[PDB]
Symmetry: C2
Subunit: 648 residues, 2 copies
């Protein structure tokens, strides 16, 4: 047990009466300890434990996710966000206006174009680089054009002025998430803020209730299948990928009620069979508005981006010309702007509510929008040497590298090193006609979500091997839902340091140590922590729920590997797979242990008290929502065993 107290970007009150914001905690990319967080009090930055500071206010935004506690499976989305040094009491969010004229990166509008300010030139008491708390010169990098026009009108409007100064500066676009946030704002000559916040929360089960931020906890690491009411997701049944709109989600049962938009009816769906991820329209995204009849130019709910910054932004030349112009300066309602706006709210009836710059909220369909892309942040032998390489190999149709003369010396050593310490769970097959291609098969360890599951990797050695690491292509036998492991990509890339902390070296690294690393580091009991951004939460209390929701996902997709392994034939491993699953009786174990696991889950259908004896079991209890998808794979796994028993 190791609960986390303070989270990033909120405000914290240790000793004296008259706070601070913290930029570090248990989540780290100065290393921290099991209970200390970074901090930076400023009216210096120290590293104090969490036992000293106290919470005063937490910062949320319309679109962020939170829970009542880190153990509560139910999550919610924020819909709206609700003492100051003069350099009586408080002041509401509507009793103070931001006197900050222009900020770095704020969107502007001119003609029918839209851009962002990349550089500024303030002059107070010199003019340079800004970042001080009167801007004079602004450098705009115009992005896209208004999507509400005709090609004759589109080609007319060109790229406007790249530098703005003097009397030419208009339409300043505000964000409904940047208001009421150390800012400089007055109204009855400046006032600086030093706050109380409450957020209107929309829970997953449809319930909406407003609460204080001191009781809530941010949900920074959501599950890939987590959705919220109003979101446009994709219902991926094995028959077809249908478009549905989420209405309610029962995170405890891992089920959801979605409206099939082609049918208009609400049907119960398994959350594991919903693939939201980008596709949709998140709350707070700036989007264009097309015209009636005209669409987004896209297909089923997948609004496109329209960002297109010029190249002169990626340089650090142009700064000398902008600085020379700025130095010469100090010496001597309603409108037609209805084609742009940010996402305000997502209605349950599949309609998106857009707020125009003229404070005019409008409701538009998803197909009439276009997302904005700003600058942003951019019989069981372990080893054998088979004669011919299989045609189903990933690199069979890949030009073979020539290597050198001493390459066969290392391969002779690797072949022995494999045959020496290869466990009976990992199988390797080499080919003489293709000395550059290898194929491995790793059986999932015991008491893991990958228990008794096949994992085939096709290998290729570069012309510089062993100086270069072996190129591994993982055969991900998923139906396009997600990755069976955070490191094992669906595209085939195996994400490890051994195949690239340490690296690959011909002096220490080897093919044997790489295979046992994949079985030892990747295929573990809690594979959710294999993601590098989650490894800092080993056994911590705030990483318990996410490990359960992932081990369940890994256990369901692991059985799908047994489906494809017994369906499509693996070249050189066909007889090896039948000896394991059909001869030694492993398919009966996979079907049997899953059947007993489904039965034990229907007993404790309403009981949330996991038995203390079932602890450390990789997947102790099933969700009854993920069981819905497991019965589909088991139904095909049972049908293959039916044809096997009928053969004899």
């Amino acid at each position: 047990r190791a609960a986390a107290k303070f989270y990033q970007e909120d405000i914290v009150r240790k000793d004296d009466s008259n706070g601070v914001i913290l930029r570090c905690w248990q989540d780290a990319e100065r290393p921290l300890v099991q209970g200390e967080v970074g901090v930076s009090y400023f009216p210096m930055r120290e590293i104090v434990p969490e036992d000293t500071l106290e919470l005063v206010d937490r910062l949320y935004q319309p679109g962020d996710l939170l829970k009542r506690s880190v153990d509560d499976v139910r999550s919610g989305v924020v819909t709206r966000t609700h003492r100051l040094e003069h350099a009586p009491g408080w002041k509401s969010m509507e009793e103070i206006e931001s006197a900050v004229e222009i900020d770095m990166g704020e969107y502007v509008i001119y003609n029918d174009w839209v851009g962002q300010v990349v550089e500024m030139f303030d002059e107070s008491l010199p003019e340079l680089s800004a970042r001080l708390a009167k801007h004079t010169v602004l450098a705009v990098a115009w992005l896209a054009i208004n999507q509400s026009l005709s090609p004759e009108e589109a080609q007319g409007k060109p790229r406007p002025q790249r530098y703005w100064y003097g009397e030419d500066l208009l339409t300043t676009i505000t964000r409904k998430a940047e208001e009421a946030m150390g800012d400089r704002v007055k109204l009855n000559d400046t006032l600086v803020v030093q706050t109380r916040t409450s957020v209107d929360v929309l829970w997953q089960d449809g319930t909406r209730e407003t609460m204080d931020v001191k009781q809530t906890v941010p949900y920074l690491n959501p599950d890939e299948y987590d959705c919220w009411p109003g979101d446009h997701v994709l219902w991926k049944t094995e028959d077809h990928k249908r478009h549905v709109v989420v209405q309610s989600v029962n995170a405890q049962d891992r089920t959801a009620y979605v409206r099939v938009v082609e049918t208009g009816a609400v049907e119960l769906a398994s959350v594991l069979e919903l693939d939201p991820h980008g596709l949709g329209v998140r709350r707070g995204d700036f989007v264009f508005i097309h015209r009636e009849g005209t669409t987004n130019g896209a297909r089923a709910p997948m609004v496109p981006r329209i960002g297109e910054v010029e190249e002169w932004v990626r340089e650090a030349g142009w700064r000398s010309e902008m600085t020379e112009l700025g130095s010469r300066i100090a010496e001597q309602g309603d409108t037609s702007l209805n084609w742009f706006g940010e996402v305000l709210d997502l209605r349950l009836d599949g309609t998106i509510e857009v707020i125009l710059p003229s404070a005019d909220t409008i409701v538009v369909p998803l197909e009439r929008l276009t997302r904005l892309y700003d600058s942003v942040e951019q019989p069981w032998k372990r080893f054998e040497v088979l004669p011919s390489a299989p045609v189903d190999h990933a690199f069979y149709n890949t030009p073979p590298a020539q290597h050198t003369r001493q390459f066969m010396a290392r391969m002779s050593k690797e072949y022995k090193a494999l045959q020496s310490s290869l466990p009976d769970s990992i199988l390797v097959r080499a080919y003489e006609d293709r000395t550059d291609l290898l194929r491995s098969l790793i059986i999932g360890p015991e008491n893991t979500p990958y228990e008794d599951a096949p994992f085939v990797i096709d290998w290729m050695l570069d012309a510089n091997f062993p100086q270069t690491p072996p190129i591994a292509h993982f055969l991900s036998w998923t139906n396009g839902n997600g990755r069976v492991n955070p490191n094992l990509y669906e595209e085939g890339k195996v994400c490890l340091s051994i195949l690239g902390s340490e690296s690959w070296s011909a002096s220490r690294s080897s093919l044997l140590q790489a295979l046992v690393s994949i079985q030892g580091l990747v295929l573990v009991k809690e594979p959710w922590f294999c993601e590098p951004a989650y490894e800092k939460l080993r056994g911590t209390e705030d990483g318990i729920v996410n490990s359960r929701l992932y081990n369940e996902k890994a256990y369901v997709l692991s059985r799908g590997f047994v489906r494809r392994a017994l369906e499509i034939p693996l070249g050189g491993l066909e007889e090896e797979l039948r000896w394991f699953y059909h001869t030694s009786g492993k398919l009966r174990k996979v079907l049997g242990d899953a059947r007993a696991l489904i039965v034990k889950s229907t007993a404790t259908q309403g009981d949330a008290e996991v038995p203390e004896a079932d602890r450390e079991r990789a997947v102790p209890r099933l969700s009854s929502g993920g069981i819905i998808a497991l019965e589909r794979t088991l139904g095909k796994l049972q049908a293959l065993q039916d044809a096997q028993t009928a053969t004899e």
Copy 2:
């Protein structure tokens, strides 16, 4: 120019003190303060019985080392080469420990070898063959004052020492012999194969008499310093009848390429170190690419001047002329002189296809370990302590060495390659047999295994299907990959020469395609060279993967660094090694054009880099530029016959629209006429020097005319489409 004499491994003599002889180990331009780099006209030499590096002018030739199977010429300027078929050696002798020179020169027919066996020799037990890899030999040493004291170790000792002062070795007795067995007799049936086991690892004592020594006739050529003995004839002291060769005089029987034979003095000849890939000799089995079917022929004669050869098709039995550029020999692919082979049973074949030679060697892993020698050292010390007392057996130094007609006629040495395709093989029984090539199987020795409209850059929409890496699984790269390629795409559009074209793709940015036009006055003049590129998963930290589309046939490569299998050989592709900081993708393109496509591409091989303009490499240079020219014109055919995805109209603008196809056909037919007029003249014209290819040989015109016929029909169909 820069002539070079004194090739490695012969015998020389200083201009002064004409009593000392040299061993000449380090030769000028080959690859402690000694073993340093040597400059133009400097050779290293050790002296029998004080190493120094002296200029070549100070020393003087005495004798030269030639073995049956080696190649030689009268001079480096001569195009016609030959092969040594027999080596006669006469030498002066001197007692090893008495230092008494016997008067008169003696032949190898009246002397024998003093050492019974040495390292690397072959031995046969049961029906197995093995090689001695390590020896434990306890020897005697004559102390300063009497005392023939014994000494136990690691071989490498012979009769005659130099230091615990100036002591003389009186005897060298090999006790334990570590034999690395290779394979068994290939004539025995598979049932009898398991009945014969892999013999012991160590051999000593009374077990030595069961072995069978195999003497190599190619090594029986008497060398300087060898420990030899006169056949029944100075004894000095235990008797010590061991002599040391003072100097030698070698005469060789040569088989020239033109079928003629003559005996020469080795002082007149010059060893043919690096021969052309197409160099054949009478009696050799080669492949002939006549059209679309490689045939089995036996070389009868070779005209090295006209670069043609008379071959005998074994399938038909007729003798036909063939261009030496069309022959594709040596791939091993034929039995050479001095090689050891396994005579198969009557009827049984080599198991391989058209003239191929099966390999035999199977060096056990204990030979490469590092160990078992500690057990051999403890074994040799145990032998010495017990050899004096009772219950111990030693010596028995027989090891067969048969001279009658024993059943050892299943494994022998290749003596001569007859013109009728048959191979003369000498058995250990000192009797020769004639056998076809199919009945033989070469022995892979253990020492052999241990040693071995135009634009410049346009981002095309889609990558074509003819791309080499179109079927490869794409990687994922890093985040800062498109930013790196943006700088790479900018660097290409910055300083790309008009002779190199690069086309990237949008549907998958990990693949690129390049095309280089060979510079003027090069064997690649106005020729297409397309390389398919793929970016690695760790790019740019890792070098880019380049696959050269070698449109050659099964003859050879268009360049020593451009393999027929696509591998481009350059240190810049992982010069300096690949670097993500300094090195870029652009400089990898201009280096391939600037370094791989030069005027004399034969020197692109790093081994031949030390030969630049020297009178040695002048012949092999023009021999290679001729091939590089014929294969370059063949690339124009493969570039217009099939289209290249992306370069579809870029090729038509350059060859058909810009008229470079008539430029290639015009320049080629001009070289045909100039080669016909200068034909016969052994000397190269003066005004035609500094030209990449001044002349084409008679055989070089043959292979080029076949490409010109297909290059003319493409010009015919182009001029016929004027409707």
